[PDB]
Amino acid sequence: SSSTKKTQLQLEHLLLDLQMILNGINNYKNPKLTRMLTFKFYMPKKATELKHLQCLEEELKPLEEALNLAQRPRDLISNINVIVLELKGETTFMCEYADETATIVEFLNRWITFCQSIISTL
Amino acid sequence: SSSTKKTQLQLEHLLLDLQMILNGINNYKNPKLTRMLTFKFYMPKKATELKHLQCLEEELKPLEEALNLAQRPRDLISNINVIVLELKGSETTFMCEYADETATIVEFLNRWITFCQSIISTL
Ligand SMILES: CC(=O)Nc1ccc(COc2ccc(-c3cc(C4CCN(C(=O)CNC(=O)[C@@H](CC(C)C)NC(=N)N)CC4)n(C)n3)c(Cl)c2Cl)cc1
Numbered sequence A: 001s002s003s004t005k006k007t008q009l010q011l012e013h014l015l016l017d018l019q020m021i022l023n024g025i026n027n028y029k030n031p032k033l034t035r036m037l038t039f040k041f042y043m044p045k046k047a048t049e050l051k052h053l054q055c056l057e058e059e060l061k062p063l064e065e066a067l068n069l070a071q072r073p074r075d076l077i078s079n080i081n082v083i084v085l086e087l088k089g090e091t092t093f094m095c096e097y098a099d100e101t102a103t104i105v106e107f108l109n110r111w112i113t114f115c116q117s118i119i120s121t122l
Numbered sequence B: 001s002s003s004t005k006k007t008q009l010q011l012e013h014l015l016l017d018l019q020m021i022l023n024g025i026n027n028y029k030n031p032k033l034t035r036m037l038t039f040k041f042y043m044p045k046k047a048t049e050l051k052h053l054q055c056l057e058e059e060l061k062p063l064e065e066a067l068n069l070a071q072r073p074r075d076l077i078s079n080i081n082v083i084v085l086e087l088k089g090s091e092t093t094f095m096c097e098y099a100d101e102t103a104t105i106v107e108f109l110n111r112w113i114t115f116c117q118s119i120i121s122t123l
């Protein structure tokens, strides 16, 4: 299917954007890296299907906030938003968050692993 | 003697402090441990005498920086610093020699735990 190729490329682009954000974070100087690891993110309890991307969508505003403190973030997050919303679509899904919060590093990596998990199935 | 007893206790204190930190790191979750293991440390080529503790002293700030990412580290490293300064004591300033291969936090701490244990057991 042609639409399956659309889902694939969109997942590849989202994976790349998250990898790019993380790459810049890994190169931060010691005092800067320390301060951004205090910014807490909500994590998914389950992330095996495309509908679970609602957990990412809801956490894009904190992500835009964290990137603003460490610096364009407004434009980059808006681009990711479009892809995230398009990738999940049916009506409205309630997202279940884990008890323990994580840092930007664990947050990004989880969603990077999520994207890699779906790409391989199609 | 009263001089050797003090040296023994202070060496056993440094050993305990490093073992306390090592217990903290090993207790971390797998994903947290992964990022902790990328923080690289400088290792001593020769560590046989009390004056070789300068290779630990210089690496004490990098240790504080690592525990700040995993976060009190400001007071604990300061406490360790005092011990090192009292043990290496003297007025002699020994210039340090470092090995080529860098090591993780676990390998760094264990090497100095090993250093402590070896000095204690020969006095
Ligand atoms: C000298 C010079 O200019 N150079 C220089 C270079 C770098 C730096 C360091 O940069 C920074 C400086 C400051 C910060 C920072 C962080 C913060 C805090 C960290 C903690 N915060 C948070 O965790 C906010 N998150 C939420 O609201 C959560 C809470 C929920 C989990 C309960 N909600 C959701 N995720 N949905 C709030 C923001 N502030 C106010 N400032 C950050 Cl994140 C960086 Cl990266 C400083 C100076």
Ligand SMILES: CC(=O)Nc1ccc(COc2ccc(-c3cc(C4CCN(C(=O)CNC(=O)[C@@H](CC(C)C)NC(=N)N)CC4)n(C)n3)c(Cl)c2Cl)cc1
Pocket: A025, A026, A027, A037, A103, A105, A106, A109, B029, B030, B031, B032, B033, B034, B035, B036, B037, B038, B039, B040, B041, B042, B062, B066, B067, B069, B070, B071, B102
């Ligand atoms: C759970 C999960 O997946 N994420 C997750 C969640 C939270 C945490 C909290 O703890 C941490 C979180 C993140 C990090 C971390 C650190 C780092 C880097 C690792 C590489 N760095 C270094 O090279 C540090 N080393 C030095 O500065 C050396 C240089 C030497 C190599 C020549 N200096 C001297 N010895 N003189 C700089 C810091 N990143 C990119 N991420 C670290 Cl080290 C810890 Cl301990 C860790 C991981």
Ligand SMILES: [Zn+2]
Pocket: A065
């Ligand atoms: Zn805020």
Ligand SMILES: [Zn+2]
Pocket: B013, B079
């Ligand atoms: Zn003590």
